[PDB]
Amino acid sequence: FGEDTVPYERYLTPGGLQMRSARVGSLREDIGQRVDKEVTPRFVELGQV
Amino acid sequence: MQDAITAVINSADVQGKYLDGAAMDKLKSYFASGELRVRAASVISANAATIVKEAVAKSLLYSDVTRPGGNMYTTRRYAACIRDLDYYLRYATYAMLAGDASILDERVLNGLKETYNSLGVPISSTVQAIQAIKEVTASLVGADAGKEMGVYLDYICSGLS
Numbered sequence: 001f002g003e004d005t006v007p008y009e010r011y012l013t014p015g016g017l018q019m020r021s022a023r024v025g026s027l028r029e030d031i032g033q034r035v036d037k038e039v040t041p042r043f044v045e046l047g048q049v
Numbered sequence: 050m051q052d053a054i055t056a057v058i059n060s061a062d063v064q065g066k067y068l069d070g071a072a073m074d075k076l077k078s079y080f081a082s083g084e085l086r087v088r089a090a091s092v093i094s095a096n097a098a099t100i101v102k103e104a105v106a107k108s109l110l111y112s113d114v115t116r117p118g119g120n121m122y123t124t125r126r127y128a129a130c131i132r133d134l135d136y137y138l139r140y141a142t143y144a145m146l147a148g149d150a151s152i153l154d155e156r157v158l159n160g161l162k163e164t165y166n167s168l169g170v171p172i173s174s175t176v177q178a179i180q181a182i183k184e185v186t187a188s189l190v191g192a193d194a195g196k197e198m199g200v201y202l203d204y205i206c207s208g209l210s
């Protein structure tokens with residue numbers, strides 16, 4: 001911060017970051033889980049016109 | 050209909066003359082080709098269902114015609130294609146055995162064009178299927194004997210064009 005910048009929260013403890021971004025909301029799909037790439041079934045594609 | 054022998058006979062009878070040396074020579078040529086023709090005809094009769102099977106597999110399967118709404122959709126229509134391809138193969142074998150492609154004109158091409166045009170049958174797709182039949186039968190009966198089968202299937206394709 002120079003002589004003109006108000007301070008701001010620059011770093012987080014891992015516990016605080018977990019509290020912020022480990023709830024049911026705000027939790028990304030890919031954080032700690034296997035992200036299975038959804039795809040239309042091959043038979044569905046074959047029968048699709 | 051007509052064959053090589055009937056063609057020679059009609060060629061003589063149109064001018065009313067008997068059979069001269071040229072006619073006997075043509076008949077001898079046909080008799081010489083007769084062994085090859087019988088061989089190819091018996092082989093194609095034995096393997097008729099197979100030939101149409103691989104022709105359909107390598108020419109039409111997994112395509113717009115087979116997809117829903119396609120003309121080859123609706124299993125009754127698929128069986129109709131199988132029957133029509135069998136008809137083409139059988140009458141091409143007839144023409145090959147006879148040596149003359151008049152049976153195709155008077156028993157296959159007679160109204161077939163109008164039939165397909167009224168029915169929405171893809172003429173080019175049918176032609177490609179017949180070409181695949183020609184390739185399969187040529188590979189099955191050799192190059193020489195397969196040449197005649199290719200000639201008559203090509204006659205069918207050109208008439209259907």
Ligand SMILES: *[C@@H](C)[C@H]1/C(=C/c2[nH]c(/C=C3N=C(/C=C4\NC(=O)C(CC)=C4C)C(C)=C\3CCC(=O)O)c(CCC(=O)O)c2C)NC(=O)[C@@H]1C
Nearest residue numbers: 046106109110111112114115116117121122123124125127
């Ligand atoms: C497994 C369930 C069984 C099996 C099925 C199987 N089918 C094919 C290929 C085709 N199936 C059809 C069927 C239809 N077309 C229609 O319009 C209708 C009306 C609903 C039906 C039932 C067709 C047209 C084809 C070929 C053309 C295409 O797929 O677009 C295959 C593949 C065979 C091949 O060589 O490609 C298979 C495996 N086969 C079995 O053995 C099981 C009993």
